Ligand SMILES: Nc1ncnc2c1ncn2[C@@H]1O[C@H](CSCC[C@H](N)C(=O)O)[C@@H](O)[C@H]1O
């Protein structure tokens with residue numbers, strides 16, 4: 001009956017990227033300076049590799065293959081401990097058939113179980129279609145590596161032609177088209193009318209958090225999930241510079257707000273706001289692109305989080 | 321090993337008559353296990369302590385929804401997880417869609433795969449698929465996938481574009497045809513993508529075993545369309561327990577050699593004996609399973625390997 005959320009961890013290596021996507025939740029670019037120091041990352045990876053509960057370590061950015069020597073070094077620290085690795089990339093490195101062969105050999109040797117390639121109309125000005133095809137076609141030689149294609153779309157950029165132009169390189173590839181979260185470059189460079197809004201406050205029984213997944217982010221913070229929407233809230237997991245993963249897990253499992261959110265869903269909070277006529281005061285959007293859209297507006301201020309304190313206190317007293 | 325999941329193929333009858341169908345399913349297909357026998361199998365899998373997931377397939381499982389719901393209700397007190405695969409014909413009615421999603425959510429259905437492509441399109445309307453995909457947003461605990469069977473002449477590019485934003489958040493997988501069932505005779509072999517060949521011994525390994533109690537009354541070691549035309553059965557008698565099925569899978573010599581040595585062990589025997597042409601092994605194929613089908617689709621072909629498997633067992637262990 002122990003702690004949860006300690007089987008996986010993600011590390012965001014850098015905000016620097018070869019691309020400058022108009023939707024990028026991190027506003028990544030070749031001149032982005034936000035990152036944890038390399039030695040600090042080596043210490044985190046070493047701890048995650050030695051950790052008794054972590055099975056999967058995931059890397060993200062930014063573009064993790066941009067400084068491949070560093071990525072390979074981190075994968076090599078993990079190797080003797082035999083933990084599984086997941087990578088996500090824009091596939092710019094697909095331009096070189098030599099880098100494609102070499103990187104797939106490294107990933108297969110370093111227990112990389114999944115590689116996600118992001119490609120769509122927002123990525124297209126920075127990466128050639130043929131680079132994506134080279135990666136997808138070569139991955140057929142590495143069946144143990146699960147390959148996914150993630151396409152970020154809007155009403156004006158649905159990536160219909162992009163997919164058709166990839167031809168048969170996508171056969172056997174898990175494709176997922178998803179809507180934008182209005183965060184980072186998407187807030188200012190994309191018209192809110194082009195972002196799909198599928199969910200509404202009327203879908204109260206369907207409003208449930210997709211799940212917690214710890215992220216040691218490139219801004220030096222630790223977040224409870226991988227959603228772009230979490231950065232705008234006041235829900236963090238870091239209390240000091242030298243923090244162990246055991247402490248990170250302990251803080252997450254003992255967070256009362258995150259416990260009630262998991263057990264009761266967003267309806268518990270929304271129903272308190274409706275009964276107290278504070279939905280408009282809290283600026284809760286009627287419609288949203290994802291469940292995380294409510295999360296942002298419910299907890300984007302210390303006062304909003306503090307509003308729920310007497311109700312959370314009452315809930316703990318009643319059920320504990 | 322291989323005892324955490326099980327699949328049951330409820331019927332070969334289907335509302336559709338897809339030109340690629342590995343079972344050649346149609347509304348006039350008569351092949352199926354009896355209903356009472358299926359009730360007994362489901363009851364046994366529900367009571368089994370090791371099985372976590374029970375999957376249903378056909379045919380079209382929603383065609384006789386009353387029987388599907390009855391089977392899901394037998395499992396319910398035992399709290400096993402269920403997976404369903406469907407052509408989504410039932411998507412025509414939004415009211416029907418809400419009802420089935422409510423049942424699915426109450427009956428621990430963790431995954432629903434919808435099959436849609438140019439082969440399915442003459443039998444199911446695009447708007448039916450959209451209704452299912454859009455309503456699934458209300459059930460985040462049900463994992464939704466879209467499986468599209470394609471050829472060089474039917475890549476389902478328009479099909480996907482016509483689904484619009486209903487596919488947002490849906491795992492889409494386009495895959496090539498296995499030359500089995502209706503695809504063998506109704507599709508030109510030049511339109512089936514051939515990614516693999518006998519030369520690349522790498523990637524000539526079985527993806528893995530998954531027990532299926534099929535609509536022909538046999539038991540298969542995997543869910544691949546290719547296996548249903550082989551003579552590899554795990555059934556020895558009418559009333560056979562899942563423990564016996566697992567025991568037979570774990571002690572099957574041909575499947576042990578296939579798992580450890582890969583398809584190269586069998587192909588090298590045929591090449592060495594100049595029987596590749598005699599056995600009709602395709603030089604090029606869409607998937608690894610394409611070799612499996614041609615290696616073992618007759619008792620004569622399977623029996624050929626027996627003295628070699630006997631030699632292998634004597635040499636090893
Ligand atoms: N505002 C936003 N809303 C939704 N997804 C976004 C987003 N900003 C970025 N993403 C997606 O988040 C993923 C990780 S971004 C960092 C990894 C890498 N450079 C890449 O592009 O894969 C990508 O699939 C990207 O398209």
Ligand SMILES: Nc1ncnc2c1ncn2[C@@H]1O[C@H](CSCC[C@H](N)C(=O)O)[C@@H](O)[C@H]1O
Pocket residue numbers: 334340341342343377378379380381405406407433434435467468469496497498499500501503545
């Ligand atoms: N010859 C073949 N090659 C490859 N996939 C095939 C096939 N025959 C059938 N399939 C696929 O196998 C899956 C299960 S068929 C039975 C389930 C249901 N009627 C359906 O269509 O989903 C479907 O996705 C179908 O497209």
Ligand code: SF4
Pocket residue numbers: 017018019020021023024025026027028029061062063090118123
């Ligand atoms: S979405 Fe990925 S590739 Fe595009 S700018 Fe952001 S980090 Fe770079």
Ligand code: SF4
Pocket residue numbers: 208209210211224225226227229230291292295296
């Ligand atoms: S609902 Fe909130 S905590 Fe859950 S994934 Fe979305 S942003 Fe993160």
Ligand code: SF4
Pocket residue numbers: 334335336337338340341342343344345346378379380407435440
């Ligand atoms: S592929 Fe599925 S929907 Fe099409 S005929 Fe076969 S069983 Fe029926």
Ligand code: SF4
Pocket residue numbers: 525526527528529541542543544546547608609612613
């Ligand atoms: S058809 Fe053969 S190779 Fe394919 S999954 Fe079944 S047993 Fe494995």
